[PDB]
Amino acid sequence: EHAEHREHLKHVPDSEWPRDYEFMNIRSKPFFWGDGDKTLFWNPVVNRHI
Amino acid sequence: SPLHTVGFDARFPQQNQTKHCWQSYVDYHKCVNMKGEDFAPCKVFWKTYNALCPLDWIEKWDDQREKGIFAGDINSD
């Protein structure tokens, strides 16, 4: 059921992702792995904010 | 006026007033949309959060309310 809900949440446009709050996903510095604004276990389907 | 202020609040008797200022701000914004009939009792919380909160805090909270990012229990209903 949760995988079905995350597949439903996959087809969400970029203006339809809600208000990321002040405390949410803060970037005090870019990360040194990959390219930047992505953590280790980063799921681009669910965790989209930046 | 010759030297009046908020006074002592029995709900916040300790040293730090950080939730006192926040609760006065949230109750002033909650008196507007919910009740809206008592404009001078609304200004009691206005004078309280004005006397207790820094202006940068009030500016950031006003910006977060206007952009919807504000984390307070504000139900426009």
Added chain:
Amino acid sequence: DVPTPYACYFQDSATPNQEGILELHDNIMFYLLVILGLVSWMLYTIVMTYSKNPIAYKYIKHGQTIEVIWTIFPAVILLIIAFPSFILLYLCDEVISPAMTIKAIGYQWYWKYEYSDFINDSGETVEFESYVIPDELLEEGQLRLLDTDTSMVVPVDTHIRFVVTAADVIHDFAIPSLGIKVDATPGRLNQVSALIQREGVFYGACSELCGTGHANMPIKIEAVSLPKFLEWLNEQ
């Protein structure tokens, strides 16, 4: 008010808080001096008597009488000096009807006072940053690392609530003549209450590390009379 060269005591008090902690410090220093005199006497007469003792009484080992005596003696000394500490702590923690409230929010190497209860033209809040006067712009007479650009001026003989927080790092709001020392964490506000008993000026410094601009961050409070304070407040 102002620190004095080759001083050995507190600065001159200006509030019931500072003279309370001064009387408490002397009341503690009494019993600290009796046990310093006792320890130093015992040590001195012991070495000067027994550095020329040929026979050591090597069988004095347990001695329960003086053991329970010197166990119950520092307990009653601490009880004696912990009664007035409790009285002064619960006395100075009370805030009993403040007649004023001024925020002193301390940014990265300056203070910004905010007289938010009061008016500038009509109703709007008063605020000003108080930078330290630099070394190159000192005129002859002004105290180095203590004399700021604008002083927080404040009415005398009235309860003031200081609501101090910060914006970048922890900055302490410390004035030792007014006996207040409360640091400024960026998360939370912190309140203190003080009523100033005499007019004059009171210097203080940031008593918490602030980065490179730590020393040059003073706090100049000018206790003025209520008509002259009201004139200054309407003038601001």
Added chain:
Amino acid sequence: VHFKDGVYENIPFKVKGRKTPYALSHFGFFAIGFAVPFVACYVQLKK
């Protein structure tokens, strides 16, 4: 395991059988220990 034991066998440095004087090693060790902070100051005053 068996190592040699004696008056000078307990220490990592060589004091007795030496080509240089020992005072060189003894005061050079504490001298570079005292000059580490001045090298730190020289770097931070260069920058």
Added chain:
Amino acid sequence: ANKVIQLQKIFQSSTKPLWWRHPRSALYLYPFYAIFAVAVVTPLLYIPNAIRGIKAKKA
């Protein structure tokens, strides 16, 4: 495979150190010494660029 008693006789009759006593010990011990020397020479070598201020070019 119960090599225990044979390995006991090997490890008790051997004037080699306790990490060289197995017959397979060179097969770990030589490339590990090479990898160790590389891994403790290199971040030491990166120190003068750190105190000089020269960050790594992103190429």
Added chain:
Amino acid sequence: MTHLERSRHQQHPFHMVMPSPWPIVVSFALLSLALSTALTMHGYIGNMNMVYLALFVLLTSSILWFRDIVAEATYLGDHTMAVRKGINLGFLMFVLSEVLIFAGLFWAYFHSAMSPDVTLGACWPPVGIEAVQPTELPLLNTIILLSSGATVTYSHHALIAGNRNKALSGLLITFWLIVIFVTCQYIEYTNAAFTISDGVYGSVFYAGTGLHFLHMVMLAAMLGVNYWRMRNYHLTAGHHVGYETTIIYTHVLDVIWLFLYVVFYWWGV
């Protein structure tokens, strides 16, 4: 025995350990790890291969130290009753240290939860973050950890009983149980609503559960080397400290997961 034969031996139980390079090698790898990650966190190195290399050197040096200690335990016969009592007590002290690290993490969680910050909404979890549900995936996690505890005590008692095939089967089963735990935890991290940078809730939540994650992967390595030693007959029926150490590690980590579960889920929701 006589006197000439008692003079051929140790006269004290305790282990005279031979000189060995693994302290200085592990410590040199630890310095290289610290320096490389402090120069890779700030872009003075272009990539993470140096940190990967230093982690590999630290791991293989620790592995070689453990190879020397199982050589001294099994093949040289130095581990007598006093030395076994000593290493048992030393592992118990190290496990107490890990318990206290987790108590510091619990104090962090309880501070940020019992004093809810006004920028969060004065509510725990904060506004906008939806918490991980207790009953869905961590219920499966806690019941497979409790069954892992039951399986290690079964297999340890089967080892003391003399039964070889029950002990090896039980140890293999609990090994695959705790790597099923690590896999379910990684799946939980993969499909989760929030990040480690998502405020103090994501901060202290992923700190506590990622610390338990790393201790469970350490337990996986320990159960693996214990299974290898029990397969290749290193453990005896009465003389075994690696297995006692690994089962008391398993029960300590199980109680730590129980506290983490009930706090972070049945009170944080």
Added chain:
Amino acid sequence: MVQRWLYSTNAKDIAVLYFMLAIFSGMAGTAMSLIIRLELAAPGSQYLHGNSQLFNVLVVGHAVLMIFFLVMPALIGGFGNYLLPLMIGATDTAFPRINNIAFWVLPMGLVCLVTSTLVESGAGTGWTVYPPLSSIQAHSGPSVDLAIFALHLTSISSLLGAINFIVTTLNMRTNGMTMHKLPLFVWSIFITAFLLLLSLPVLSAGITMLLLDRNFNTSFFEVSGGGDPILYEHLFWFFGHPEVYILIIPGFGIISHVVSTYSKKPVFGEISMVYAMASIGLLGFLVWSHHMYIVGLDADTRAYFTSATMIIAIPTGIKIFSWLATIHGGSIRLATPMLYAIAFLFLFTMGGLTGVALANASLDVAFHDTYYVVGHFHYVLSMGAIFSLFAGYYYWSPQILGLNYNEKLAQIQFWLIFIGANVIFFPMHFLGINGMPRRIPDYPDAFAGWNYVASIGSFIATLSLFLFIYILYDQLVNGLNNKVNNKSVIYNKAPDFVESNTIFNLNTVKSSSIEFLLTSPPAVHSFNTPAVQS
């Protein structure tokens, strides 16, 4: 010599390695303290051209060097690893390789601390590494990360030494020794190892929280994110007061031995001394928030903490009175360890009394972050740890080296460091009670007189340090010569007042501990047959 020193596995060689590194880093910490005191002699930038960042960097260098690289390695590592095997009759401590890796993880704590000072701007944060001053918005660059790794590596060293010490003094005792028949130094290292084991986890947690906040965009203490900088204060001081009792309890173990052996009568109420050390170690973990009386705790919280902090004046008072009881009625042979023990007793009572005035929640409004607290802690730290260090060195050095030190030179070294340390740290109480703030490279010019007299006395203290590092040279190159002439004191205990010199010569070592009955320099594996005791 590659085996014996690099791949070392006996506690004595590791102990002398601990001591060589300890006195090296103590020399460096004293150099940073001299630059602090030399810039702090007059108002205005004197030697550092402005540059308050460099002053704060040297302050954390002197602080973390003298604490985590001098006092802990010397007292814990060197003296514990030399005597905790010996005084209980242990052959060689259990887990010798962990005992080797603790020492060998120390000097890269030194290396990465030195390069933290060298890199981009230096950690300018205090020895308390408080955020947001220590976080990435105030301190960029990798310097605070390397200081955090220095604290991590020395935490690893201290915790591993604690585990090795605990199972050694529990399991590896000799056959006659009950726990109640253990010496006081062994009990002291025991209790300190328990405090290390119960303190260093919380510190490593808080410091890795700080490193995670700096580099991985997480927010444990960042306010923009909801964090509390008071949480780091809580965690650091929950480590930090048990740390200062960790630093002081080996002094309480050394001074008891030297006082009983130069007083020629045993310690007064030895089980009471063990109980008072245990009560201090239990009461340490309960008083950690007297270091933050200013942040705005509740009045009930501070009223609890002033009582709990004052409570430690009772067992420390028990010990400082039992020492006077051990000395009272003896035959005081005033050598250098007895001189350092007497001066430790007096100046430690002074520092603890300034601390007990500091324990009040209402007085710490007047005293926090002033120079009064540095009067308190430099009295208890400098005298109580360094005078204990010098007493233990001058006490155990000719036994564990076989080389006698010059005694006149050692006594002028004591008198120089005593009047030098008094002349520096006594005006700090005046500076604090007049309101001079802490960690400032510059001050209002009203503090200049007491800053000048303390800056004078720092040169007396460091001149006594240089005389000590010449005394080490003289002991090293003229040990046997100082034995054979009358420049040194051969027998620490005289004959009693009936005993003939011949009857003394048949029984020359009258010690209540095994260490003095070992040979000059003790054998590389002594205690072949385990030492028996009734």
